[PDB]
Design a protein around this ligand. Structure first.
Ligand SMILES: Nc1nc2c(ncn2[C@@H]2O[C@H](COP(=O)(O)OP(=O)(O)NP(=O)(O)O)[C@@H](O)[C@H]2O)c(=O)[nH]1
Ligand SMILES: [Mg+2]
Lengths: 170, 68
């Protein structure tokens, strides 16, 4: 069975864990529980095909950043998450992507840009600005809400499809 | 004050620690669809630990949760 090693990255509090838990099961955590490191495994069907996802949910708090080199070397695709009401988390995306490429010594790393918390009326990052950033990166952009489950599966499955194509580019 | 815990089905978590092992691993098991009453927790270098063990007493060691 085909396997995909997904890694969820982004600043603290953007919703990485909430998104991951929503994918694994239908449940929205509404509490403060910062991640150190958590790995999840789930069998899914994508485009009619059964796949096994290994999802690494990483720490946004910089005190744990020493772990990044290792999980960036091992990960096959990266879900790069910011919150649409947190401009700083959007600015942090650039350096996560740059560090991933630095660690993997490659300009072609499967990635998806994710703007989370789209259920909020208070927005500071326009959809159009984030779409344009993704356009220039050459990667997909998806706006999600872990609270409402809007486009959560789409985000992870789009990342899988990016990896699936990258493997065939060989 | 962290403990690395290997979980069933090739999963893992790192927990920050004074509460027992059950209380501090309850959430990690629940979001993965695991009932603590169906699992045992072990200290590596395997010896079974009581779920009510103080997690503070295990800081620095690696634990493993396996289906019973
Ligand atoms: N309104 C709203 N709140 C959300 C959403 N996703 C997460 N949250 C809230 O945002 C806070 C942070 O969520 P969490 O998933 O723990 O964020 P994180 O990115 O994993 N943080 P860390 O990097 O420290 O582990 C929590 O209060 C969570 O309830 C969302 O889509 N909408
Ligand atoms: Mg988290």
């Amino acid at each position: 069975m085909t396997e995909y090693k997904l890694v969820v990255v982004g600043a603290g509090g953007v919703g990485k864990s909430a998104l991951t838990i929503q994918l694994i099961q239908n449940h929205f955590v509404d509490e403060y529980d910062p991640t150190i490191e958590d790995s999840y495994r789930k069998q899914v069907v994508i485009d009619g095909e059964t796949c096994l996802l290994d999802i690494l949910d990483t720490a946004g708090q910089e005190e744990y950043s020493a772990m990044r080199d290792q999980y960036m070397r091992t990960g096959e695709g990266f879900l790069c998450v910011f919150a649409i009401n947190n401009t700083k988390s959007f600015e942090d995306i650039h350096h996560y992507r740059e560090q991933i490429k630095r660690v993997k010594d490659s300009e072609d790393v499967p990635m998806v840009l994710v703007g989370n918390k789209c259920d909020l009326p208070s927005r500071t990052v326009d959809t159009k600005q984030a779409q344009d950033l993704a356009r220039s990166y050459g990667i997909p952009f998806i706006e999600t809400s872990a609270k409402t489950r809007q486009r959560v599966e789409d985000a992870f499955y789009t990342l899988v499809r990016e990896i699936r194509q990258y493997r065939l580019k060989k | 004050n962290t403990i690395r815990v290997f979980l069933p089905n090739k999963q893992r978590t790192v927990v920050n620690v004074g509460m027992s092992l059950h209380d501090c691993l309850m959430k990690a098991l629940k979001v993965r669809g695991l009932q603590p009453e169906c699992c045992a927790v072990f200290r590596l270098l395997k010896a079974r630990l009581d779920w009510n063990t103080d997690a503070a007493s295990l800081i620095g060691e690696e634990l493993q949760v396996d289906f019973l």
